[PDB]
Structure formats: C-alpha cells, structure tokens
Amino acid sequence: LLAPGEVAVAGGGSGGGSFSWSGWRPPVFGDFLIHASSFNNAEATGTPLFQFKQSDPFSGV
Amino acid sequence: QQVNDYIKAKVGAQRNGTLLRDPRTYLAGMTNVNGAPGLCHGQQATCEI
Amino acid sequence: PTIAHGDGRRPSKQRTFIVVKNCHKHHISTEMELSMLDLEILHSIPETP
C-alpha cells in the first residue's frame, strides 16, 4: 500500500517492478455537499451526475 | 412606488440583509459587517406578531 | 396467562405474542495525507549519515 508510485504494487515496493504497471491510472473522485432533499437516495450508483454552477460567492453547498 | 419607499423607511425594514442562510453553510471570508457590530445580551431572539 | 372468573364474561383464550427486532448498520471513516518524499524515501537505502 505504501508505494512510491501512483499505483499500489506487490511486495511493498521492494523492487521497482513494472515502471508503469500495464498503463493503469487510478480514478479521481469528487466530493459534494448536497441538500439532502435535493437528491433522492434511491438513485442507483450508475447515474451520471451534473453540477449546476451556483452564481453566489463563497457558498459551501 | 413612492408609497412603498415611504413605508419601508418609516418601518425600519431591510436591515441586516447581507446574510440569509445559517453561517455554517458559507466557507470563509463572510464579513457580515452590515448587520451588527456587537451584542451585549446574546442571540437575537425573533419575536413574531 | 389468565384468571378464571365466575362472571359470565368472555374468556381470553390462550394468547401468544410475537415481536421482531432488527439491526442498525453503522459506518465510520477518516483520511490521512502522506507526502511523497516520505513514501519515496522509506524504500531507498540510505548511504551517507
């Protein structure tokens, strides 16, 4: 888990192994703070999401 | 219009109008200088008629 | 259980009560940050003091 590169690799990084392992890039995530009534929980984990750019400054939600 | 401006002036409305939702929503930099400078008793309790 | 009365009242027969109880699922998490110099150095062999 404590790898020097960007992907975790076997052995604990003892050997460099694959320089770029099979060309695998880790995903990037995004956190959002939603008004719970604005988003129905029953949506399955597959739905593509769209963010409206609120036009008020320094908001947090 | 000038009936509306006459009422709002003599009634004391439109004050403290800078910040609306509770301040935990806003991240930082919210000055809110306009509403008040300091309180000697505590949270303003809203009475209603 | 019950009690036998000498009145003419209707008898509550042998009664059985069933009650179910369900679990509650709880979750917890935290996050850390590690600089890449530390992860990178941890592996390299030191040479000079």
From Swiss-Prot, chain A:
Location in the cell reads: Virion; Host nucleus
Give the domain of life. Answer: Viruses
The entry sums up its family as follows:
Belongs to the herpesviridae TRX1 protein family.
Task: Cite the record's note on assembly.
Answer: Interacts with TRX2, MCP and capsid vertex component 2/CVC2.
- Tell me, what does this protein do in biology? Structural component of the T=16 icosahedral capsid. The capsid is composed of pentamers and hexamers of major capsid protein/MCP, which are linked together by heterotrimers called triplexes. These triplexes are formed by a single molecule of triplex protein 1/TRX1 and two copies of triplex protein 2/TRX2. Additionally, TRX1 is required for efficient transport of TRX2 to the nucleus, which is the site of capsid assembly.
Q: What is this protein called?
A: Triplex capsid protein 1
The gene from which this protein is expressed is TRX1
Curated annotation (Swiss-Prot), chain B:
Q: Which family does it belong to?
A: Belongs to the herpesviridae major capsid protein family.
Q: What is the lineage of its organism?
A: Viruses, Duplodnaviria, Heunggongvirae, Peploviricota, Herviviricetes
**Signal sequence range:** none
Where in or outside the cell it occurs: the entry states:
Virion; Host nucleus
Protein name (database record): Major capsid protein
| Function (record text) | Self-assembles to form an icosahedral capsid with a T=16 symmetry, about 200 nm in diameter, and consisting of 150 hexons and 12 pentons (total of 162 capsomers). Hexons form the edges and faces of the capsid and are each composed of six MCP molecules. In contrast, one penton is found at each of the 12 vertices. Eleven of the pentons are MCP pentamers, while the last vertex is occupied by the portal complex.
What organism does the UniProt record list as the source?
Epstein-Barr virus (strain B95-8) (HHV-4)
| Subunit structure, interactors included | Homomultimer. Makes the hexons and eleven out of twelve pentons. Interacts with triplex proteins 1/TRX1 and 2/TRX2; adjacent capsomers are linked together in groups of three by triplexes, heterotrimeric complexes composed of one molecule of TRX1 and two molecules of TRX2. Interacts with scaffold protein; this interaction allows efficient MCP transport to the host nucleus. Interacts with capsid vertex component 2/CVC2. Interacts with the small capsomere-interacting protein/SCP.
